[PDB]
């Protein structure tokens, strides 16, 4: 479900820390979202990300 | 901020840090109870920190004040970034003094060439990450609409202008969003976006504060 999405920071210049699936490593990780134009691979909690991904 | 210098302590008393536990954006104090920042810095809960210089060290003169209202521009567009501006109302008024004071809103858009002052606690590298403890500053000109559009074909809306150096090496950066671009005593811009930071031909893009002057007035009037 999440194996085909990269982690995208985007061009904005905030630091909104979020969760995303890292496809190489196989798990949910913390990443620094710039606040805009992400993809669907970002979640507010580890829990939310693990559920959406499996 | 990439390629700038550490500000003199408390010489930009309008600069604030927004904090949700750690610092994550900038802002500008525009009256005793209101701060301007970027819409994309939105979070549900935010603490405004005023009189900061070194955000990691308690220096004794900071004011820590929770946001009571956090109001994104009602036309902020997540797809194009049009109208990337936000207002925050403090839960109690800032105490104005030598270290904490307001920056005036602007009376005209700024002219191309005008030297401006951009500041905050964002990253200082174009490649890699080095987040500073002390406020950084940078002197940079406003660019023409033509250079700005040529740099970002198709993406520069009416709410946006560019400020920097086309040769690269100097720009705002992640964790600066929301912070001020001050030109001749006035708040002319808000740190918004770019491709990378300080890359050649990719100047910073900033929200035009002049265009929101009536919206700011109205929103202050309507939430008093
Ligand atoms: Ca401090």
UniProtKB/Swiss-Prot annotation, chain A:
Where is each BPTI/Kunitz inhibitor domain found?
A: 2-53
Q: List the disulfide bonds in this chain.
A: 2-53, 12-36, 28-49
| Site positions for Inhibitory (P1) (trypsin) | 13-14
Domain of life (superkingdom): Eukaryota
Query: Subunit arrangement?
Result: Monomer. Also occurs as a complex with tryptase in mast cells.
Briefly state the protein's biological role.
Answer: Kunitz-type serine protease inhibitor. Has high catalytic efficiency for F10/blood coagulation factor Xa and may act as an anticoagulant by inhibiting prothrombin activation. Inhibits trypsin and mast cell CMA1/chymase and tryptase proteases.
Protein name per Swiss-Prot or TrEMBL: Trypstatin
Q: Please tell me the species this chain comes from.
A: Homo sapiens (Human)
Name the gene that codes for it. Answer: AMBP
Q: Which residues of the full protein are shown?
A: 286 to 338 of 352
Swiss-Prot record, chain B:
MF term (GO), any: serine-type endopeptidase activity
Site positions (Required for specificity): 171
Q: Show the stretches that span the lipid bilayer.
A: none
Q: What class of enzyme is it?
A: hydrolase
Activity modulation comment: Not inhibited by Kunitz-type trypsin inhibitors.
In-chain residues carrying the UniProt-annotated modification Sulfotyrosine: 131
Task: Say yes or no: keyword Chloroplast present.
Answer: no
> Where expressed (tissues)?
Detected in pancreas and pancreatic fluid (at protein level). Expressed in pancreas and brain. Detected in ileum.
Chain positions recorded as Ca(2+) binding sites = 52, 54, 57, 59, 62
pH dependence per the entry: Optimum pH is 8.5.
GO CC terms for this protein? extracellular region; extracellular space; tertiary granule lumen
Q: Which cysteines are joined by disulfide bonds?
A: 7-137, 25-41, 116-183, 148-162, 173-197
Compartment(s) where it occurs, according to its Swiss-Prot or TrEMBL record: Secreted
Q: Which cofactor does it need?
A: Ca(2+)
Q: Which residues form the active site?
A: 40 (charge relay system), 84 (charge relay system), 177 (charge relay system)
Gene Ontology terms describing biological process? antimicrobial humoral response; digestion; endothelial cell migration; proteolysis; zymogen activation
Textual note on the cofactor: Binds 1 Ca(2+) ion per subunit.
Q: Which family does it belong to?
A: Belongs to the peptidase S1 family.
Explain the purpose of this protein: Digestive protease that cleaves proteins preferentially after an Arg residue and has proteolytic activity toward Kunitz-type trypsin inhibitors.
Full protein name: Trypsin-3
Source species, please?
Answer: Homo sapiens
